[PDB]
Design a protein around this ligand. Structure first.
Ligand SMILES: CC(=O)SCCNC(=O)CCNC(=O)[C@H](O)C(C)(C)COP(=O)(O)OP(=O)(O)OC[C@H]1O[C@@H](n2cnc3c(N)ncnc32)[C@H](O)[C@@H]1OP(=O)(O)O
Lengths: 156, 159
């Protein structure tokens, strides 16, 4: 059986390995130390869920944080979600998503957001199957990012 | 018109909501505004705020709402969630002043990643952002914005 649960500091090694797997899957600077500090700190920057087979082994994860919508208020953003290849298509990713929804309601967040690459149609299809809307396709939203000098020029 | 851009205070939340509702009403989407003044107060002005807000003041005539995010690709990032200026005050550079200020906040915190979403009708904005060195990630990289809205979320959570 599989359980989705809050990460503990002891999971940081396993989580770092899985972050590296998802980064490679997506085709492109965090230490185990940074994870422990940022993900559990005071003051945590983000929150991690692990999928664990019941010794027990961690086979997937999600990372989310709290954001905001001006129409709806408190919102969660699901940043990373990943299940190891051997463990895909046995409901684990859907269970991680359901857990994020449960956490959302528990924390007074009516809705949750994510970003996904348009080549990743199997993921997009799952999110649509679970009730999500593609607002890029529906409304025309384009993500922009300024880095380094671009942000400096933006700041005039 | 003479305008200042300043940090919002808890007492500006009535005005922020009035502006959000004015936009929604303009778009014929009034029924979609579920946020409350009490939420803007609680979510913005307690110990761990969900957002930060700059207002444009002559009468508050505009706002920019942002928050920080942690991207597993680039680390700490500022994300501009929304900028609105009342139509009567459009053409006066107020929106440009707000975005400039948000960019300065990022830099002041020692963060140089800035992210936002822009609607595709807004060619003026898109052209300027590219000219400044920004990348359109949707066009460049195929990023799509997904949202599990209220009904979908409740269903997933087993209601
Ligand atoms: C928000 C951002 O992080 S988007 C990034 C999403 N992450 C990835 O694409 C990493 C690689 N893939 C995975 O981690 C997983 O396959 C996930 C998270 C996408 C889906 O989780 P799983 O446990 O495999 O899926 P689950 O069993 O809950 O089933 C749903 C669907 O997954 C999708 N899927 C993606 N890859 C597979 C796969 N290898 N095998 C079976 N289904 C897959 C399909 O849409 C399937 O739908 P269907 O049953 O109607 O045919």
């Amino acid at each position: 059986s599989v359980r989705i649960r809050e990460a503990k500091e002891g999971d940081c090694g396993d989580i770092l390995r899985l972050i590296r797997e998802l980064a490679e899957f997506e085709k492109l600077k965090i230490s185990e130390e940074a994870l422990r500090a940022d993900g559990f700190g005071d003051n945590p920057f983000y929150h991690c869920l692990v999928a664990e087979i019941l010794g027990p082994c961690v086979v997937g994860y999600g990372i989310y944080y709290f954001i905001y919508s001006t129409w709806k208020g408190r919102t969660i953003y699901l940043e990373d979600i990943y299940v190891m290849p051997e463990y895909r298509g046995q409901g684990i990713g859907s269970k991680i998503i359901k857990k994020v929804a449960e956490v959302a309601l528990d924390k007074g967040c009516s809705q949750f957001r994510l970003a996904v690459l348009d080549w990743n149609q199997r993921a997009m299809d799952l999110y649509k199957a679970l009730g999500a809307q593609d607002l890029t396709e529906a409304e025309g939203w384009h993500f922009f990012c300024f880095q380094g000098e671009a942000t400096r020029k933006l700041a005039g």
